[PDB]
Enzyme design. Sequence first.
Site, PDB file in Angstrom:
ATOM      1  N   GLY A 106      49.182 144.298  -3.113  1.00 19.25           N
ATOM      2  CA  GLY A 106      48.526 144.020  -2.021  1.00 19.25           C
ATOM      3  C   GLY A 106      48.252 144.964  -0.773  1.00 19.25           C
ATOM      4  CB  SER A 165      43.612 143.609   3.602  1.00  8.71           C
ATOM      5  OG  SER A 165      44.259 142.360   3.057  1.00  8.71           O
ATOM      6  CG  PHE A 221      51.802 143.690   7.661  1.00  4.18           C
ATOM      7  CD1 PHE A 221      52.106 144.330   8.840  1.00  4.18           C
ATOM      8  CD2 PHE A 221      51.353 142.304   7.650  1.00  4.18           C
ATOM      9  CE1 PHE A 221      52.317 143.533  10.197  1.00  4.18           C
ATOM     10  CE2 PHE A 221      51.587 141.734   8.949  1.00  4.18           C
ATOM     11  CZ  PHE A 221      52.023 142.169   9.963  1.00  4.18           C
ATOM     12  CE1 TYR A 279      40.398 140.199  -9.242  1.00  3.30           C
ATOM     13  CE2 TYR A 279      40.291 138.014  -8.223  1.00  3.30           C
ATOM     14  CZ  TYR A 279      39.797 138.829  -9.089  1.00  3.30           C
ATOM     15  OH  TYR A 279      38.823 138.595  -9.956  1.00  3.30           O
ATOM     16  CD  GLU A 280      40.688 142.598  -1.617  1.00  4.58           C
ATOM     17  OE1 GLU A 280      39.655 141.665  -1.348  1.00  4.58           O
ATOM     18  OE2 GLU A 280      41.759 142.584  -0.981  1.00  4.58           O
ATOM     19  CG  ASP A 305      46.747 137.847 -11.719  1.00  2.71           C
ATOM     20  OD1 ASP A 305      47.597 137.928 -10.762  1.00  2.71           O
ATOM     21  OD2 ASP A 305      46.652 136.577 -12.266  1.00  2.71           O
ATOM     22  CG  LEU A 320      50.529 139.598  -3.957  1.00  2.00           C
ATOM     23  CD1 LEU A 320      49.996 139.743  -5.318  1.00  2.00           C
ATOM     24  CD2 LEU A 320      51.999 139.880  -3.961  1.00  2.00           C
ATOM     25  CB  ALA A 321      48.817 137.103   1.588  1.00  3.07           C
ATOM     26  CE1 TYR A 359      53.383 130.969   9.738  1.00  5.35           C
ATOM     27  CE2 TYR A 359      53.433 130.079  12.042  1.00  5.35           C
ATOM     28  CZ  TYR A 359      52.785 130.620  10.824  1.00  5.35           C
ATOM     29  OH  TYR A 359      51.356 130.925  10.742  1.00  5.35           O
TER      30      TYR A 359
HETATM   31  N1  LIG Z   1      51.117 135.933  11.710  1.00  5.97           N
HETATM   32  C1  LIG Z   1      51.205 135.811  10.208  1.00  5.97           C
HETATM   33  O1  LIG Z   1      51.306 134.596   9.747  1.00  5.97           O
HETATM   34  C2  LIG Z   1      51.898 136.680   9.763  1.00  5.97           C
HETATM   35  C3  LIG Z   1      52.359 137.621  10.591  1.00  5.97           C
HETATM   36  C4  LIG Z   1      53.398 138.558  10.201  1.00  5.97           C
HETATM   37  C5  LIG Z   1      53.301 138.488   8.878  1.00  5.97           C
HETATM   38  N2  LIG Z   1      52.623 137.663   7.698  1.00  5.97           N
HETATM   39  C6  LIG Z   1      52.995 138.158   6.247  1.00  5.97           C
HETATM   40  O2  LIG Z   1      52.121 139.070   6.245  1.00  5.97           O
HETATM   41  C7  LIG Z   1      52.218 139.673   4.803  1.00  5.97           C
HETATM   42  C8  LIG Z   1      50.906 140.220   4.608  1.00  5.97           C
HETATM   43  O3  LIG Z   1      49.963 139.810   5.814  1.00  5.97           O
HETATM   44  P1  LIG Z   1      48.792 140.393   5.622  1.00  5.97           P
HETATM   45  O4  LIG Z   1      47.824 140.512   7.036  1.00  5.97           O
HETATM   46  O5  LIG Z   1      48.960 141.634   5.245  1.00  5.97           O
HETATM   47  O6  LIG Z   1      47.666 139.762   4.578  1.00  5.97           O
HETATM   48  P2  LIG Z   1      46.385 139.796   3.896  1.00  5.97           P
HETATM   49  O7  LIG Z   1      45.881 138.700   3.354  1.00  5.97           O
HETATM   50  O8  LIG Z   1      45.443 140.648   4.665  1.00  5.97           O
HETATM   51  O9  LIG Z   1      46.752 140.675   2.342  1.00  5.97           O
HETATM   52  C9  LIG Z   1      46.551 140.066   1.163  1.00  5.97           C
HETATM   53  C10 LIG Z   1      46.606 141.328   0.004  1.00  5.97           C
HETATM   54  O10 LIG Z   1      47.175 140.624  -1.129  1.00  5.97           O
HETATM   55  C11 LIG Z   1      46.233 141.095  -2.115  1.00  5.97           C
HETATM   56  N3  LIG Z   1      46.213 140.108  -3.161  1.00  5.97           N
HETATM   57  C12 LIG Z   1      45.952 138.696  -3.240  1.00  5.97           C
HETATM   58  N4  LIG Z   1      46.035 138.275  -4.165  1.00  5.97           N
HETATM   59  C13 LIG Z   1      46.491 139.227  -5.121  1.00  5.97           C
HETATM   60  C14 LIG Z   1      46.654 139.045  -6.372  1.00  5.97           C
HETATM   61  N5  LIG Z   1      46.570 138.042  -6.923  1.00  5.97           N
HETATM   62  N6  LIG Z   1      46.929 140.335  -6.990  1.00  5.97           N
HETATM   63  C15 LIG Z   1      47.214 141.222  -6.318  1.00  5.97           C
HETATM   64  N7  LIG Z   1      46.971 141.213  -5.175  1.00  5.97           N
HETATM   65  C16 LIG Z   1      46.696 140.309  -4.569  1.00  5.97           C
HETATM   66  C17 LIG Z   1      45.035 141.329  -1.351  1.00  5.97           C
HETATM   67  O11 LIG Z   1      44.371 141.735  -2.205  1.00  5.97           O
HETATM   68  C18 LIG Z   1      45.465 141.807  -0.366  1.00  5.97           C
HETATM   69  O12 LIG Z   1      45.868 143.054  -0.650  1.00  5.97           O
HETATM   70  C19 LIG Z   1      51.976 138.481   4.292  1.00  5.97           C
HETATM   71  O13 LIG Z   1      53.292 138.293   3.191  1.00  5.97           O
HETATM   72  C20 LIG Z   1      52.254 137.286   5.323  1.00  5.97           C
HETATM   73  O14 LIG Z   1      53.361 136.253   4.853  1.00  5.97           O
HETATM   74  C21 LIG Z   1      52.090 136.656   8.584  1.00  5.97           C
HETATM   75 NA    NA Z   2      49.136 143.221   2.878  1.00  7.84          NA
END
Ligand SMILES: NC(=O)c1ccc[n+]([C@@H]2O[C@H](COP(=O)([O-])OP(=O)(O)OC[C@H]3O[C@@H](n4cnc5c(N)ncnc54)[C@H](O)[C@@H]3O)[C@@H](O)[C@H]2O)c1
Ligand code: NA
Length: 387
Positions: free
Chosen positions: A38, A41, A43, A65-66, A102, A130-131, A224
């Site tokens: 992941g 984007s 973190f 995944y993009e 994936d 990854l999310a 949460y």
């Molecule tokens: N405020 C919030 O709700 C909050 C706050 C802090 C942290 N978080 C946690 O932050 C962590 C990341 O947040 P974010 O903003 O970085 O998320 P984001 O959605 O920006 O990041 C998603 C990443 O997942 C990758 N990904 C998605 N599907 C994939 C797959 N099937 N195979 C490979 N890669 C895949 C996407 O490409 C991307 O890289 C998450 O684990 C989330 O739980 C959430």
């Molecule tokens: Na991320």
Amino acid sequence: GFIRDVHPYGCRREVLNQIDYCKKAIGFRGPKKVLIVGASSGFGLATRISVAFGGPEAHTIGVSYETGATDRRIGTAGWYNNIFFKEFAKKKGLVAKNFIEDAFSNETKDKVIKYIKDEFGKIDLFVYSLAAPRRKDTGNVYTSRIKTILGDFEGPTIDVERDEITLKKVSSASIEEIEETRKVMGGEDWQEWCEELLYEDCFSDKATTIAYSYIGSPRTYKIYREGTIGIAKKDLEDKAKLINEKLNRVIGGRAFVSVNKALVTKASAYIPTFPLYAAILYKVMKEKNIHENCIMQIERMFSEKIYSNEKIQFDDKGRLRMDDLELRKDVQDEVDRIWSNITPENFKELSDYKGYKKEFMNLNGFDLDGVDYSKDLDIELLRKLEP
Ligand SMILES: NC(=O)c1ccc[n+]([C@@H]2O[C@H](COP(=O)([O-])OP(=O)(O)OC[C@H]3O[C@@H](n4cnc5c(N)ncnc54)[C@H](O)[C@@H]3O)[C@@H](O)[C@H]2O)c1
Ligand code: NA
């Protein structure tokens, strides 16, 4: 023809803005060979920029995944982030590989490990972040749902298109949804990555792996800590221990969960009560010069808590708390102070809505100083761009 949800050069600039923050910071050392799942984007991205230009000048493999531009579509932000980060990283002579696959499938892991022993070299820091809204395998498809386990959660959400509050509601989850959400958002795939990396001999000695979470304030515990997200994260938290223990034996390393702070996502945009809490929090934390965004969050996490001079301070649970500033007594009170005065009519001025919205558009490359928006783009220029 027009751009939609993503501006490709606003994305360049946003990555660059985070690079420039990193280049200027106090700098830290530690990791040199880094794997991020992941990476495109949030973190994952910030972690990647923080290890590459934080001053460890580390080499990175991003899994994400993009999809990109065809003659008709424009593609995703994360896609462009991956490209621009490669560009800026190679210009500094660092390795940036990109598996756009994936991550849940075995033939992806095998691609990745195969690449590591053959070319990259022993990984010293592994970040899993990854999310996805869904998973696969076997041949079944699991879907992640934001729900409760008992009763209802209603609260305000923010409609950034129309600069207004909407009351939205979340109902109770079925047993299987509680279960599909655990397969997706829990620490199983993490665990399986970890194990396969260990035994195929890809962790440097004393190597490190994190996954990311969120805890929030009591106001959101129904979602949460108690809901389908809380059950997924308590599972993740549990796997942290079961890996901390392993890598400590076999290779003397550690595993743990880092509890980040409230940040503006797309996915966090239509959970009740959180958009508004975060916008308030943003104000509060700005009038105390302690607001952090994604890249400040990670920079601070590395140069002060993970890879610093001092010893690593864990919570009473084996979790690193980067929401430490968010959950400070004075701060929470002030949110609870403002909360009770917020109205659909005045919210824009009692919360940092501006900043909340600015940060939303910026993820996608909009509303950024340094970019010419009235300018037009060339579709054949974006497609030739490759990761
Ligand atoms: N405020 C919030 O709700 C909050 C706050 C802090 C942290 N978080 C946690 O932050 C962590 C990341 O947040 P974010 O903003 O970085 O998320 P984001 O959605 O920006 O990041 C998603 C990443 O997942 C990758 N990904 C998605 N599907 C994939 C797959 N099937 N195979 C490979 N890669 C895949 C996407 O490409 C991307 O890289 C998450 O684990 C989330 O739980 C959430
Ligand atoms: Na991320």
